[PDB]
Amino acid sequence: EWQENKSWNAHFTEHKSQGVVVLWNENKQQGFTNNLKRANQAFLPASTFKIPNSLIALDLGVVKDEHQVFKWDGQTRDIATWNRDHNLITAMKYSVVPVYQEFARQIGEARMSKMLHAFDYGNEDISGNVDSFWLDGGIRISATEQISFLRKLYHNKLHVSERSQRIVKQAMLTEANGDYIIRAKTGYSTRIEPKIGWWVGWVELDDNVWFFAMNMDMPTSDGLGLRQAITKEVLKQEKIIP
Ligand SMILES: O=C(O)c1cccc(-c2cccc(CO)c2)c1
Ligand SMILES: [Cl-]
């Protein structure tokens, strides 16, 4: 049961942008979106792929645990937070592409492809370079497909160990207070048009969980903060968060 609420378009147009928010009420098994078409249009996952990539790296032993240190390779990159050592937690927090590129190389094409199929993840197509296919290869995923994948992770139903799923959900922790917990991952796709930003995850309440997946046009990096801001305005409008 899906419902289209075009009134949310105001949250995008008011910021001179276009995009989609998809919400899923777990208790009621009901979905909501401002744009049914765009909700099912498939985009590069970009750094949202760090969720499945983390799961695979942990389950195969490429990553021992969330404490293992991935040493900076000494190559100065334009994002200061990348020029340092990281563990799984900080690598997720700062979307440290080069750490996850090495994960993918150690995972390898064959095992990566099999795992994405087992996860039913997007179009399951890793065509391209194994260390960048989620940035400029053939893999694609829609907002509704993100929700489906995230729900499996929440319920520990993905075909990796419970431990791997618990660790990745810890690493997804973004915000927590007395009212809610948000576990999510941002994404920023620039190598293939249209340039977009992602924010996918869920909101944990005392008595329910709301899954969310949004993407929006992102012609410049100046609007990246709108990914979370627009999502939270929708959540506030729907009285999911205060
Ligand atoms: O999604 C973000 O919030 C985020 C976090 C860390 C880095 C970036 C990012 C911004 C511009 C270019 C590049 C490419 O090197 C990356 C975006
Ligand atoms: Cl946690």
* φ, ψ dihedrals at 86, nearest 5°: -140, 155
Q: Which residues are annotated as a binding site for a beta-lactam?
A: 47, 50, 95, 227
What method was applied to determine this entry?
A: X-ray
The rounded Å distance from CA 189 to ligand 1 centre is: 9
Helical axes 97-107 vs 109-118, angle rounded to 10°: 100
- Residue 205 CA to residue 182 CA, distance in Å, equals 9
- Ligand 1 binding pocket (C-beta < 6 A) is 47, 78-79, 94-95, 186, 188, 221, 224
Residue 47 falls in the annotated catalytic set? yes
The first and second tokens of residue 114, run together, are 């099999």
The rounded Å distance from CA 219 to ligand 2 centre is: 34
Q: What is the residue-wise DSSP string for 176-212?
A: E-SS-EEEEEEEEE-SSSSPEEEEEEEEE-SS-EEEE
Instruction: Give whole-number Cα distances, 118 to 106, 147, 153, 158, in Å.
Output: 19, 16, 13, 8
The rounded Å distance from CA 182 to ligand 2 centre is: 10
- Residue 169: how many other CB atoms lie within 10 Å: 19
The first and second tokens of residue 196, run together, are 């977009």
User: Domains plus CATH for the chain?
Assistant: 1-242 (3.40.710.10)
User: Could you say which of 7, 17, 47, 113 is catalytic?
Assistant: 47
- Residue 19 CA to residue 194 CA, distance in Å, equals 11
Contact between residue 201 and residue 212 where contact means Cβ atoms under 8 Å apart: yes
- Residue 213 CA to residue 190 CA, distance in Å, equals 18
- Residue 41: how many other CB atoms lie within 10 Å: 14
Q: Which residues are annotated as a binding site?
A: 47, 50, 95, 227
